[PDB]
Amino acid sequence: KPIEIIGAPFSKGQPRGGVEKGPAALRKAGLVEKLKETEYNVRDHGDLAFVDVPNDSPFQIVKNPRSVGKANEQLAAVVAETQKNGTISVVLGGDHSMAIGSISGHARVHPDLCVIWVDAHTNINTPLTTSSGNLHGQPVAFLLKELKGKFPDVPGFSWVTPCISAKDIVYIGLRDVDPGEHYIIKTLGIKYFSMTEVDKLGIGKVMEETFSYLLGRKKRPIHLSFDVDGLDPVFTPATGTPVVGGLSYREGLYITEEIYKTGLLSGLDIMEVNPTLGKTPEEVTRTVNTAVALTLSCFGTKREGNHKPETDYL
Amino acid sequence: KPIEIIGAPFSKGQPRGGVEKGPAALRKAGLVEKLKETEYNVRDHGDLAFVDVPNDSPFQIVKNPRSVGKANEQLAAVVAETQKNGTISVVLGGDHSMAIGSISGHARVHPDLCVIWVDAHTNINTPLTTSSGNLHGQPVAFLLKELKGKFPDVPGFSWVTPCISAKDIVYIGLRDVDPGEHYIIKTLGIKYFSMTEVDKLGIGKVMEETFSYLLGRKKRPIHLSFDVDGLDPVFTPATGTPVVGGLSYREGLYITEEIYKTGLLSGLDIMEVNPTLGKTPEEVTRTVNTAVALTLSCFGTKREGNHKPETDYL
Amino acid sequence: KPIEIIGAPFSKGQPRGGVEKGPAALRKAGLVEKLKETEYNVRDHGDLAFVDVPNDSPFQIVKNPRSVGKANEQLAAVVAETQKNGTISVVLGGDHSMAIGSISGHARVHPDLCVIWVDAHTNINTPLTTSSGNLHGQPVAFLLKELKGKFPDVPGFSWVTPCISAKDIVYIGLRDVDPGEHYIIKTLGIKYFSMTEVDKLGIGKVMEETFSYLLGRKKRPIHLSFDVDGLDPVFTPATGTPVVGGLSYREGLYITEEIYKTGLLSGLDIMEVNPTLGKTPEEVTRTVNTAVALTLSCFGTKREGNHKPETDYL
Ligand SMILES: [Mn+2]
Ligand SMILES: [Mn+2]
Ligand SMILES: [Mn+2]
Ligand SMILES: [Mn+2]
Ligand SMILES: [Mn+2]
Ligand SMILES: [Mn+2]
Numbered sequence: 001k002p003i004e005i006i007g008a009p010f011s012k013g014q015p016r017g018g019v020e021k022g023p024a025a026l027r028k029a030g031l032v033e034k035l036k037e038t039e040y041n042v043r044d045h046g047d048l049a050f051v052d053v054p055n056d057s058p059f060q061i062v063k064n065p066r067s068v069g070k071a072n073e074q075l076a077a078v079v080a081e082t083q084k085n086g087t088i089s090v091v092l093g094g095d096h097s098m099a100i101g102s103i104s105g106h107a108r109v110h111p112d113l114c115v116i117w118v119d120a121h122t123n124i125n126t127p128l129t130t131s132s133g134n135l136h137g138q139p140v141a142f143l144l145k146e147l148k149g150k151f152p153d154v155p156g157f158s159w160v161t162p163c164i165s166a167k168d169i170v171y172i173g174l175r176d177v178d179p180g181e182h183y184i185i186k187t188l189g190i191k192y193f194s195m196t197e198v199d200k201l202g203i204g205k206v207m208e209e210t211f212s213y214l215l216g217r218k219k220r221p222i223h224l225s226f227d228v229d230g231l232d233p234v235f236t237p238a239t240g241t242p243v244v245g246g247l248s249y250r251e252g253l254y255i256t257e258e259i260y261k262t263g264l265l266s267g268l269d270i271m272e273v274n275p276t277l278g279k280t281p282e283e284v285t286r287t288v289n290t291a292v293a294l295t296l297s298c299f300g301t302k303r304e305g306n307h308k309p310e311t312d313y314l
Numbered sequence: 315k316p317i318e319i320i321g322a323p324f325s326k327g328q329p330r331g332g333v334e335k336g337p338a339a340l341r342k343a344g345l346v347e348k349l350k351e352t353e354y355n356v357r358d359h360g361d362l363a364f365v366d367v368p369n370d371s372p373f374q375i376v377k378n379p380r381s382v383g384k385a386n387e388q389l390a391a392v393v394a395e396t397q398k399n400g401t402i403s404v405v406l407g408g409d410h411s412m413a414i415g416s417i418s419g420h421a422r423v424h425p426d427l428c429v430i431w432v433d434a435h436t437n438i439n440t441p442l443t444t445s446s447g448n449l450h451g452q453p454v455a456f457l458l459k460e461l462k463g464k465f466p467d468v469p470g471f472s473w474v475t476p477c478i479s480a481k482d483i484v485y486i487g488l489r490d491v492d493p494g495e496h497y498i499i500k501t502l503g504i505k506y507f508s509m510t511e512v513d514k515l516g517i518g519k520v521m522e523e524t525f526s527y528l529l530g531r532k533k534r535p536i537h538l539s540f541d542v543d544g545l546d547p548v549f550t551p552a553t554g555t556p557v558v559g560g561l562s563y564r565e566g567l568y569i570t571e572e573i574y575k576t577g578l579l580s581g582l583d584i585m586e587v588n589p590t591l592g593k594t595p596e597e598v599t600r601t602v603n604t605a606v607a608l609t610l611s612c613f614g615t616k617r618e619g620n621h622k623p624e625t626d627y628l
Numbered sequence: 629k630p631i632e633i634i635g636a637p638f639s640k641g642q643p644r645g646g647v648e649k650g651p652a653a654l655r656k657a658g659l660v661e662k663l664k665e666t667e668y669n670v671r672d673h674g675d676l677a678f679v680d681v682p683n684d685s686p687f688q689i690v691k692n693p694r695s696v697g698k699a700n701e702q703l704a705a706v707v708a709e710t711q712k713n714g715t716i717s718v719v720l721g722g723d724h725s726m727a728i729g730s731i732s733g734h735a736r737v738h739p740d741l742c743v744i745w746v747d748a749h750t751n752i753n754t755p756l757t758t759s760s761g762n763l764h765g766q767p768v769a770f771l772l773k774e775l776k777g778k779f780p781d782v783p784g785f786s787w788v789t790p791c792i793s794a795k796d797i798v799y800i801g802l803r804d805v806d807p808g809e810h811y812i813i814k815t816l817g818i819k820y821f822s823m824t825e826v827d828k829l830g831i832g833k834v835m836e837e838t839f840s841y842l843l844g845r846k847k848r849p850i851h852l853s854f855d856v857d858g859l860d861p862v863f864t865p866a867t868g869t870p871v872v873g874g875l876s877y878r879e880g881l882y883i884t885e886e887i888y889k890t891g892l893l894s895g896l897d898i899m900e901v902n903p904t905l906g907k908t909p910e911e912v913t914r915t916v917n918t919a920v921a922l923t924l925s926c927f928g929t930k931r932e933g934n935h936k937p938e939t940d941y942l
Contacts, residue, residue, distance in 0.1 A: 039909045056887075122619075129627060150628050175617045182619030183627040194618035199568040200518040202827035245563040245617075254827040275635040303807025303873070304822035305750075305813075313757050314778050436933075443941050465940050491933025494941035498932075508932035514832035559877045559931075569912040 002087035003040045003299065006078060006102075007047030010071050013136035016240045018276030023047055025275045027287045031092075031295060036298045041181025045082070051098060051114035061133035067157020068135045072101030076159075079105030083266070088111065090295065093271030095124060095136040097239070099225045103143055106267040107163035107314070110221040113266065114214040115169045118255060119227035121244040122146040122174060122181040122192075126151040129283060134274075136240075140169070146188050166231040168192050170210045172255065173230040176243045194244055203251040207258045215262070215314050223267035224259055224298065228291055238278040238287035249290055256297035270295055316401035317354045317613065319346060320392060321361030326378040326410025328449035330554045332590030335359055337406040338587045344603045345406075352613050358398070362389060367400035377447035378472070383470020386415030387543060393419030397580070402597035404609065409450040409554070411448030413539045414474065417457055420581040421477035424535045427580065428528040429483040432569060434557040435539035436485060436495040436506075442467040449627050450554075450586075454483070462500050478505050484524045486569065487544040490557045509559055517565040519599055521572045528589060535580035538573055538612065538613050542586045552592040554600035563604055584609055629810050630715035631668045631927065633660060634706060636674030640692040641686050641725025641764035646904030649719040651675055653903045657916045658719075659923060673710070674703060689761035696763045697784020697817040700729030704787075707733030711894070718923065721827045723764040723868070724751060727853045728788065729769055733896040735791035735938045738849045741894065742842040743797045746794035746883060747855030748871040750799060750809040750820075754779040757808035764868075764900075768797070772886035794818050795905030798838045798930050799825070800883065801858040804871045815891050823873055831879040852887055852926065855898045856919055877918055884925040896926055 007023035027044075035042045044124050050110075051074075052065040079089050079102055096119070098300045107113055117123075117140070124140040130149050145162040154279040171192035175249075177185075184191060190211055193206045201209075232246035259265055273291050278284030293301075300306065305314065321337035341358075349356045365378040365388075393403050393416055405416045410433075421427055429435075431454070438454040442465050455461055461478040485506035499506060505519045505527055515523075528536075543553040546560035561569075567627075573579055587605050592598030607615075614620065621627065635651035645694055655672075663670045679702075679767040706719050707730055716897070719730045745768070752768040755761075756779050771773050773790040799820035805813075813820060819841055821834045829837075842850075856890040860874035876882075887893055901919050906912030923930075928934065935941065 102621055123939045126628075174619070177619030179619070179621045180627045181622035183625070185619070186621065187628070192618065194565055194616075196568060196617045199564050202516055202518070202828075202830060204830075245567060250823055250827050253873060254824055259823055302822075303803045303805075303824050304820065305802070305807070305810030307807040307811040307814070311807075311811070314754070440942065488933070489931045491931075491940075493933065493935035496933030497935040497941045498938075500935070506932065509878055509932075510882055510885055510931050513878050514830075516830055516832075559881065 002042050003035060003042045004082040004087045004089045005044045006082070006096040008051055008075055008091055008098045009047050010094035010098055012067045012071070013095035014134045014240055016274065016277065018093045018274040019093060019240065020277045022094055022273040025273060025284070025288050026092050026263060026270065026291060026303050029292050030044060031292050034292065034296060035299060036175070037157070038301065039253045040299055043087070043259060045078070048078060050074065058133055060127065061062070061130055061152060062127050063133040063276070064133065064154035065154045066137070068097050069154065072098060072104070073159050076108070077100030079267070080108040083109035088266055090270070093269060093273065094158050096225070096227050096271045097135040097139055099139040099269055099271065102267060102269050103223055103225065104160060104163060106223055110266060111163065112218070113164070113168070113221040113223050115164060115223045115225060116172065116210060116259065117169060117171045117225050117297045118230040118247070120175045120226070120229045121241065121247055122172055122185060123179050124181050124184050125163060127154055129178070131178065132254035146186070147184070168214070170209065170308050172206065173247050175245055176241070183243040198247070198251070199218060207255060211262065215264070219264065221266035222259065222262065222264045224265065225269040226271065226294060228270070228287065231290065235290050236287045239272045240274055240277065251304065252290065252294055253297050256294050257302060260298055260300055260309055265298055268295070268298055315354050317349060317356045317404060318396040319356070319358045319399045319404050319406065320396070321406045322389055322412045323361050324364055324407055324408040325414055326381045326385070327409035328448045328554055330591065331587065333408040333554065333586060334435045334580040336408055336587035339587060339598070339602050340406050340605060343606050344407055345430070345606050348610060349613060352615065354613055355392065355400070359392070362392060363467065366389065367470070372447055374469060375442065375447040376441050376449065378449070379468045380470035382411050382449050383468065386412060387420070387473050388415070389432040390419030391460065392417030393581070394422040397423035400580070402580055404582045405584070407583060410541055410585045411449040411453055413453040413583055414456050414587065415582050416473060416581065417539065420479060420537055424580060425477065426532070426533060427478070427482070427535045427537050428452065429478060429537045429539060430486065430524060430573065431470055431483060431539050432486045432544040432561070433562050434489045434543045435485055435541070435555065436488060436491050436499060438498050439493050441468055441491060443492070445492065458483070458502070459499070480530070484528060486520065486524065487561045489531060489559055490555070512561070512565070517568050519547055521569060525576065529576070529578070533578065536573065536576065536578045537581035538579060542584070542601065550589050550601045550606050551597040552585050553589065566604065566608055567611050567617065572607050573615060574612055574614055579612055581611055583610070629668055631663060631718060632710040632715045633670070633672045633720065635720045636703055636708070636722055636726045637675050638678055638722040638726055638843050640695045640697045640699070641723035641923065642762045642810045642868055644902065644905065645869065646902040647722040647900060650722055650901040652899060652917050653912070654898065654919060657920050662920065662924055666929065668927050671715070673706070676706060678702065681718065681784070684694060685760055688755060689758055690755050690763065690782055691761040692763070693782045694784035696725055696781065697860050698733070698776055700726060701787050703729035704733035704736070707895070708736040711737035715903045716768070716894055716896070718896045719898070721897060721901065722832050724853070724899045725767055725856055725898065727764040727767040727897055728770050731851055731853065732788060732791060732899050734851055738894060739791065740846070741792070741796070741849040741851050743792060743851045743853060744838060745797060745799045745853050746801050746858040746875070747799065748801055748857045748874050749811060749855065749869065750802060750805050752809050753806060755782055759806065759897050775812070796927050798842060800838065801835065804869070816833065826875070826879070831882050835883060839890065843890070843892070847892065850887065850890065850892045851895035852893065853897040854899065854922060856898070856915065859918065863918050864915045865911040866902050867900050868902055868905065880918070880922055881925050883933065884922050885930060886915070888926055888928055893926060896923070898923055
């Protein structure tokens, strides 16, 4: 199978500059070369160049609406392409607001996809419920069908079409949810595994249930949107919104190893890696290294080891 | 329901000065204000003023017997009072020796209560088995009924009446138990989940079993006496007796979230927080912050989020 | 029962000097004295003096073959001896290549023994599959019966006799396996629990299955060969090959506590402790301290506590 790396060095989805440097840091770490060592064919599409919308006045509270809306429109164009050629898209973030265009483009080709959102947040704030106008915490609001018309149209997002419903998404790792977001997920009945469910069940049983929930009836493509703050700050410290008591390095790898095993991975997002937020160079090395390790586990790298088929090592 | 914070800035239960500053640190951190944001009604009773017993000569090995005995007599007068008005008592420690008066007063109003003791120690050393005369490691000895008359009467504790039996208590997080204490718990058959049981079972199944053990037959009020060294030193470093290999931040919160769900929390003790033992300001912040987080989870704060009833956020 | 400490300050099994200092570090930490406090009789045999083979030319890729082969021939002589007097052998490493003579000598006296290998690696590289000629990553290749004649005879190892079969060994903690090694374990069908199985099952269920697998039919002596990099670098940083995402301090102790419980521990290897690889004195302290804690805990020290029999502490 083919893999296409897509760099989305974008940061207007939030106030902390630095996430744009994410793709570079991940490539600098040898992400592309390491992937080629796997059984997949790898093609690096390079980094997208995002045109900055001048005079991007805030829409009520929402900041940089047009810049974000445009960058995502361009990204969804690119993704919907690579998918068309039947390749697996891998988007290197920049902030999680780019999930809008990554999933949108993906859905255009595979309308029956389901999503597994690993994060410490929901990001289902609507332009009306955000305490801050930051879009990185609003991605899912723009995508769901149920939240259609429940908030005013935003400048630059008119091209967006709610592609997935509340039944097609599952959250894993939640631990920092605003009152508004919590109201939303409870009301729409969205399936989620907050850290307390993970503690109660064990990452093993959690993956078992997310699969039977999303793939029980129909086998469909899976879009894994991974926010790096999904794991505890001890493993991925260089992010903008670190929350204590998250997913361990082991639980994170377990999740990607399983998803690999389903053989249904299609889209993948490695978001929020911010190289400039590391207190020491080591914190940054730590962060990037796990991110790379996750990506790698999504495409086959097993902890138990790997050996090339047809090769008699004896 | 009503909540009553009661500060017990006491430290004579052990040699390291500093725990008396615990209540201040917890309030300074915004404990009371944060609680008011919960569905409970909060009333701060302030800090108790403990009269120092002059010429408090040690009883054999036991140090400051009268001072400790008196401070506890006063604290269980206060607790028995608030419980009488049907409010939930929350005691902010100093040292764990104050559990004597916290549980004594509580038992006066609710004689059928059961205890969940989170800690790395048992604190069931009797005045005859302690290697040190420190009372903070002897609380439970004075409470249980089975250990009645198995040790000489101590100066200042004649007011104490063994209120709970070996069947009404469960330990969680044990990892540093003296030979004597281990003899006692084995002999009296006290239910406990040391770190090895937690490793074997997983915090989820441990809470399941403590509940069926203590509430299987009769539903009764629960008194959660939380020693902050119950968690690993990496989360709560500012304590007097830190032991490595303890409960994680996640496991600690899991235990309080569950207890909240039983709807039977009646008394709570947040003990051993010593602000002066933090090697760096951050260590102290870390400690205080999770202590507050635990208290908050006992009264509803869920990791999956919270939303106010009857409020349509859309 | 009798215990015999045997120091193997050897390091030619790998390129990083320092592991020879392991035994001293462990003794300096009070390992022997602390053991005497247990119910076992302890005898320190001292450190073996290994004669250096001059002009030890590499065999193809394999480095220091003769020096390593000889040191192990001497070690297996010593071990086979103490076992013959019915005492439990405890080998303090240098590098894990010494497992060859530790297990060989042990098997001479107890041919029906089974092995529990805790490590992040397999070390089942054969002289033909190693990418580096380092022997510390080839121990198991020389011991297995199934891998007999699958590789050229190496200078100095002609005294070795494959003592255990693929059915007598279980790995726990794997997370860094070369393609060749992975081919080998899959082909020979060796039972293992990599970090993903530990995540899926929980250390509790893992130990349950390794026992039923190795002791289900016949109760036989157990040789625990512990590689200190088996735990995560956060607990045992001072090693030559640290791999992230390993066994926690708690899981490591759980494993030794269970093995003690079987009452079948016969041989024990505490390998790879390298005092010179600690970035700070604390890292080295940390490492040695848990190594000592594991050894203790192999011989009875329980987290729930210990009390001497027949002693009425009341
Ligand atoms: Mn996030
Ligand atoms: Mn996110
Ligand atoms: Mn304690
Ligand atoms: Mn305590
Ligand atoms: Mn190893
Ligand atoms: Mn090894």
